[PDB]
Amino acid sequence: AVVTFMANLNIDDSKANETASTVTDSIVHRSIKLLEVVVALKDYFLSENEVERKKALTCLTTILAKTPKDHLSKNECSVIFQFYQSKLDDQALAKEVLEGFAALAPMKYVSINEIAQLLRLLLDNYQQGQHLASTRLWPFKILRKIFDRFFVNGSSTEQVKRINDLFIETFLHVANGEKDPRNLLLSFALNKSITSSLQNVENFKEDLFDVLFCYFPDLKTALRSAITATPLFAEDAYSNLLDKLTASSPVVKNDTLLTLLECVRKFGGSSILENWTLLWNALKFEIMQNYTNYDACLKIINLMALQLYNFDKVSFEKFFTHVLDELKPNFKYEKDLKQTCQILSAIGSGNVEIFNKVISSTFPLF
Amino acid sequence: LINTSEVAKLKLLIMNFSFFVDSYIDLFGRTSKESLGTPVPNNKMAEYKDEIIMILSMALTRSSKAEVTIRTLSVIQFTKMIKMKGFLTPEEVSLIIQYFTEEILTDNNKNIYYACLEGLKTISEIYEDLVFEISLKKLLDLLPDCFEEKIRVNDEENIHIETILKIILDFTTSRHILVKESITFLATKLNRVAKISKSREYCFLLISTIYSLFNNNNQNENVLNEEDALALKNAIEPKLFEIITQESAIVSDNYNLTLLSNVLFFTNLKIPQAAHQEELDRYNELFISEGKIRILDTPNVLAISYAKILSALNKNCQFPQKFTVLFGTVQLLKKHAPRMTETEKLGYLELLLVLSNKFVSEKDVIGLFDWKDLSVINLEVMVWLTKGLIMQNSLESSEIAKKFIDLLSNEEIGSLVSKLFEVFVMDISSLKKFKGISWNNNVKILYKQKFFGDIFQTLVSNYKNTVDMTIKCNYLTALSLVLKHTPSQSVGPFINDLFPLLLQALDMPDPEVRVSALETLKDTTDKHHTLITEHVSTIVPLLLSLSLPHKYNSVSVRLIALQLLEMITTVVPLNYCLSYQDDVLSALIPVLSDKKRIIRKQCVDTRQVYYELGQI
């Protein structure tokens, strides 16, 4: 197969995928020439001139992604040796290394030595996400895929239990330098998953929202689904969410009311049973303050009442008696009927029993 | 480059050399801790290295003490020449260290003083053993056996006894060998000045220096590593109990005992977890189960240290005796309270809080509840436990909060509860999610705001539903003591209903509530304006009385009254502000003439700004 040599030498001619197809044809022909072409490329990008090195490296990464057939773990670790040295030397060739990382992370051919060498040195020398638009765009990809490969709790962390804690601050290392919305979405989704799927985040929590808040201002619903992903944002969510009841701009108020919707939905009943009084105080203040914010806060009140009712009838009864003690003159008299009547309208729209409670509590008044 | 001691010639020589050192650096390199002795292959500066060394040595030393620029440039060029990779031998840097130390102890000139400090610190960060051997050991040797002596550097010039402590505080902030040996030697001298000498301030300063050096390393987590901090602990801790045994100034003064508690908390904060447990067990055996000291049977001051011990020892390790020590300290607080001293009682309360937030679960606390007895000790116990419960963010703490509000409607006990109600919301400084530690407690930062949202509303409703001296004063004091620790700008929705009690809280003895309410009116008038406009005719003379000198108006309180007067005059339109110019101008004469002068300067500024706003 002369196609092997002609592709291996014509990649320097900036043929891009045209010679990559010939490389694949060569690999099909001789079935052993993949290693020969990659090792002949190993010193082919060793030349300092930019064209030679970058064009050899792009095809090396492409055909390495196209070669998951025979690919050993220690050979794998040796493959990223040149990836790291190219990261260390210069940029504008490190991008191809970035697609190579984002291609080698998904595959199961990641050794224990590889996961450790990654989690240590991919930020030791490269310091991912610090420079250049694409050279900061792809690091989020490579860390996302190395998370979703085996570090994600699909098979728990029986052999990747070492990377849990340090992955927190290696994702925090790659932050505060990405401004394009795609990297923002990526960081949001990474926080969302790295809190919820991942275990023992409570030891190192509340710092993963730092990158999100720095990227927080549009297409921001990923951050909003993140702050509601797991009850670990519980301690975090209110920490910001109550403050967002005091926000001035109504768009963030509405978005944060939606986030509190998913929060009350997926923080069980213990947290809502904990914070029912303060949340009703804040949401009544916002009722007096105000897809608008008013329907969002009525849905907040409805879901919160439903959560107390389904979790503990005692808590929902305490809520109902507090609401009655505070608003009964409003219902019985001719003052503030709109807001309070809508409040118990949303409350009673939860179930038949709560509706009967609302009816028996308000109809005798007026 | 000719030998000269003249200010002009030597100064131009030194500032020229300042560029040749840079050329040499750019051509060859700079120091690394591995390249501390490795020289570059060839250059012409090596042929001139003796001349530049000699000229720098005579420029700093063997020179008059009046040279500020000459000696500053001398130490700067000394440091810069050190900054080259192994081009100066350890003998040269030893001579430079000796020069810096001698010229810094001889001359007080803060130019040469702080320049020599900078040079010594750079040598410390580039030469551990060298500086520790020449400068640090000598400085530790200048101090004598007895306190309050003149540290005779030479025949005439002498420094203070605290000068050595200040110099120790200066460097060794990031030098592992320096800081560890310094902690050891300062502990040795603490023991010695307590045993063979009779001093208090020297022991206090030494233990505070130990605390500061531990803090400067726990801020880095690497100057004293986990095992390094363990070894230094094993060195200092027997040296700390042996000075506990003798009356010293750490047992004689409870403040030095608190400094020892801080030192133990810092040195156990950097302890490996595998080595925590046994130590914890030892403590769990030394303080609770057995030992001469029994915190569960007899009150003792050293118990306070054990609190800092428990927050610093591991949580997710086997600590079987946690509920029993909580019950024992509750019983001791109930029984021994008249004979408990302030340090003992505060330490046992901190121990209660540490167990509540760290070791004992919420079930132990809720099983310890007894509201039948309306005694002071019972309220202390329930408040300091439900404080950790609030710090844990649960129903009970939030529901117990309402219980407290209700019980605060009592006449003679509701007043005590109101004045003690500050405890629920305070900083801890020992149980938060500190950097490093993660097993510290069940930390929740949202406790403050949540507690406010649970307390304020009911309090204000009760105040507006109250008549008399006592119960209204209780409501005001409780809401004020809650709002004082919670940030005022973080509690916004509550401000509107808070404005009546906000205006109420401006006349009461504690300057703490005064500063808090003044800050809260600042935030309110920054945000709210209808309340300010409708209430200015009421607030202005109250701020005037605040600005008047009084047994309750501190100079800071009057300064804050000035600041609020300025802020409310800025926010309120000119219509009302014109009507309230002369009163402020007249009732401020003891404020621009009081004991402090920032108070005086700011009262002058307040008077001038009021006058210019009224005249325009």
Numbering used by the authors:
A (entry chain F): 9 to 225, 242 to 314, 338 to 413
B (entry chain C): 414 to 1029
Authors' own words:
Here we report cryo-EM structures of the HEAT-repeat protein Met18 from Saccharomyces cerevisiae, a key component of the CIA targeting complex (CTC) that identifies cytosolic and nuclear client proteins and delivers a mature iron-sulfur cluster. Met18 is a 118 kDa alpha solenoid protein comprised entirely of HEAT (Huntingtin, elongation factor 3 (EF3) repeats, protein phosphatase 1A, and the yeast kinase TOR1) repeats. ScMet18 has a curved S-shaped structure comprised of 23 HEAT-repeat (HR) units; each HR contains two α-helices that are connected by loops. We find that in the absence of other CTC proteins, Met18 adopts tetrameric and hexameric states.
To address the preferred orientation issues that we observed with the Vitrobot-prepared cryo-EM grids, we prepared grids of ScMet18 (SUMO-tag was cleaved) using a chameleon, a commercially available piezoelectric cryo-EM plunger that is based on the SpotitOn plunger developed by Carragher and co-workers. To our surprise, the data collected from the chameleon sample had tetramers present in addition to the hexamers observed in the Vitrobot dataset. The tetramer contains 2-fold symmetry and was refined to 12.77 Å. Both the hexamer and the tetramer have similar overall dimensions and their chains have similar curvatures, despite the fact that the tetramer contains two fewer chains. As a result, the tetramer is less tightly packed than the hexamer, especially around the more exposed N-termini, since its protomers are shifted away from one another as compared to their relative orientation in the hexamer. The protomers of the tetrameric state appear to be less tightly packed than protomers of ScMet18 in the hexameric state, and thus the ScMet18 tetrameric state may be more prone to issues of particle denaturation. Notably, residues that appeared to be involved in binding Cia2 (R1010, R1013, R1020) are buried in both the hexameric and tetrameric states of ScMet18, indicating that ScCia2 cannot bind to ScMet18 without disrupting these higher order oligomeric states. Similarly, the N-terminal residues whose substitution was shown above to impair association with client protein ScLeu1 (R144, K187, F217) are partially buried in the hexamer and in two of the chains of the tetramer. In the other two chains of the tetramer, these N-terminal residues are mostly exposed.
